[PDB]
Amino acid sequence: KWASLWNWFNITNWLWYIK
Fold this sequence. Notes:
rod-shaped; viral protein; amphipathic alpha helix; monomeric
């Protein structure tokens, strides 16, 4: 299902900190 959009939607929180 559309449950394959949150696994990355939460990454933009820490990954944004990594970059």
